[PDB]
């Protein structure tokens, strides 16, 4: 039941994506059922919404060129990248139709918790975990926050727990 | 509603390839289905799917010429010269058809080693991004079988594909920005 | 939308869901007037209370479900909103709030004749 | 189930009265059981009280003269007048004894809703709705509001629904 | 009497269109059935009816030429140049047939959105008198698929229609004065 480094969400922030098999690879490891718990915290005075989604086989695309992305841009690992363009999900698929994937809404007025159980989803019964990014956990702030003053931290923390890894 | 099933939604039987040759001499087309953006976008909606090909080769010339169309799966060698000894090999599907007859038809069964084709592959091969080595099917090489008549020929070949027996998995949102290349999904 | 560009004949009831995203403290009322295609879209509030409308209050409820009666596509209807009262927020929260609209067809939604799409080049 | 125009309650505000048969007359109309729902909204930081009352046969009186009021001062209609003197209810009857009529208390600390059902109350079985004001819905702010800053809007909205009008 | 049923009374299979083209280059004919006054008067007798088409295209030339005949329903785009990319679309019925073979045959099912075709429409569209927007069926575009041989061609196309599976409603008195146009019923 591992936890990652907490990220800071402000007005200028624009999204986060982890690759699930890889981002969890560099912590004490070498059929996997992923469980993901995402919880931010704010007071009653803050406001804003998010969108926690877990996209399978999410293949990115480089912006406005013909070069495929490299080893370092894809597998950043355990830090999690940032969307250059969240509105098109870095591949041209619209965010407005992105609710087809398993997703939950963190709306800071109602709740501040989300939990998604991710099953094993691959054509082959085996998988090379060093050469394959199975899921992509992505959170996207739709409605940015705001107080009377400048923006706050409102830290977000992702907790991942697999089952039966090998 | 019998109309909107996925087995009926992807059975359009559209064109994929059309490249002529004048009398190098033989036509070799890879079987990747990402040829036309009309059919490619309809396959963007699903993650994993499984089907068979049902190739139809239509041939018109601008004369009683005989054509050979050979299918070569992955791993086997592909010919480079028209009279090569790979054409004489019998360990691969070949069909011999004329022009005057109705056009040829041959179906290609599901030949991935996994349970389904992976349309999207977030991973690397060896060490390439977005290339699954178990995804590709092969290629069909079409040559002519005649001594060439020293007159004005223009042999134009059209290839059609009807994917049937469809099964689909994990629907995905469609693409709204136009394509940059056919190797990946840039914008 | 992106599915029903492929087909050319459609019929079925639609459902719209709105969602508020302001702070905990803020309240205020809204009305959502639906207008059939046989009537004009009311640009004044006093004529807008004649049509089918619902009084929505963020505060007591954070979301709302609006059912559209169905009509087939043969060859137009409007869903409009009106600010009922002025928004009141506390001194600490920001003043600007937000709304988000959802859409989903019901189970009587049907498609008949398949054609190519003009959406992509 | 009609709604009226929302009014703004401030410190300087001093009361509101509608005539029920008349104020509802000018909306799509020409045994009536009235139902009245009154709801204001405020945060936890505001404070103050109201008094929603429904006075039958409320006959007004002109201030400090001998002239009876006219057609325009009585039947204002759908806007609702304002008390010139709420403490004597514009007729000399004290506000302190005004709880004999059907009434509810909107106290912004406890609740912000009130609902009064008004039955048919006339000697004759028929009534001329163009020449007779049956009830008078009156709200009176007893304790005015207050924050650290100046006064707020705290809008009040009256919703009226008859049953079996003709 | 098996002779005088309405299913047998309107099954004549007459000609509707005959327009050649010399080697603009492709033939586009609207599917309105008000082509010949012989068949048009037999449809004047009924108000509402319902059927299917069974098109047959007969082709003679004045040579091993291949012909494509594409059917386009209403709402979809129609091509304007012979090599346009609308011909490559697979979301519409196409048939590829030679000249030497027996002629092609294809049936078109009932595609109005109402219960029957309205032959007479006392009403307006938008804002036209006598035009029902759910009445029209589409059009078939016939092109050739060859590089043109620079010799004297004369390709003449004939189209036949057998309306079968007829159902009729509300018989009407026949027309005695001759026609003025094909848009309406002037005299």
Automatic annotation (TrEMBL), chains A, D:
Coiled coil: none
Domain Picornavirus capsid: 1-145
Compartments where found: Host cytoplasm; Virion
Function: Component of immature procapsids, which is cleaved into capsid proteins VP4 and VP2 after maturation. Allows the capsid to remain inactive before the maturation step. Lies on the inner surface of the capsid shell. After binding to the host receptor, the capsid undergoes conformational changes. Capsid protein VP4 is released, Capsid protein VP1 N-terminus is externalized, and together, they shape a pore in the host membrane through which the viral genome is translocated into the host cell cytoplasm.
Quaternary structure note: Interacts with capsid protein VP1 and capsid protein VP3 to form heterotrimeric protomers.
Family, similarity comment: Belongs to the picornaviruses polyprotein family.
Name recorded for this polypeptide: Genome polyprotein
Native source species: Human enterovirus D68
UniProtKB/TrEMBL annotation, chains B, E:
Subcellular location per the Swiss-Prot or TrEMBL entry: Host cytoplasmic vesicle membrane; Host nucleus; Virion
Highest taxon above the source species: Viruses
Function in brief: RNA-directed RNA polymerase: Replicates the viral genomic RNA on the surface of intracellular membranes. May form linear arrays of subunits that propagate along a strong head-to-tail interaction called interface-I. Covalently attaches UMP to a tyrosine of VPg, which is used to prime RNA synthesis. The positive stranded RNA genome is first replicated at virus induced membranous vesicles, creating a dsRNA genomic replication form. This dsRNA is then used as template to synthesize positive stranded RNA genomes. ss(+)RNA genomes are either translated, replicated or encapsidated. Protein 3CD: Involved in the viral replication complex and viral polypeptide maturation. It exhibits protease activity with a specificity and catalytic efficiency that is different from protease 3C. Protein 3CD lacks polymerase activity. Protein 3CD binds to the 5'UTR of the viral genome.
Recorded family membership: Belongs to the picornaviruses polyprotein family.
Quaternary structure and interacting proteins, as annotated: Capsid protein VP1: Interacts with capsid protein VP0, and capsid protein VP3 to form heterotrimeric protomers. Five protomers subsequently associate to form pentamers which serve as building blocks for the capsid. Interacts with capsid protein VP2, capsid protein VP3 and capsid protein VP4 following cleavage of capsid protein VP0.
Protein name per its UniProtKB record: Genome polyprotein
Source organism per UniProt: Human enterovirus D68 (EV68)
Shown chain mapped onto the complete sequence: 618 to 831 of 2188
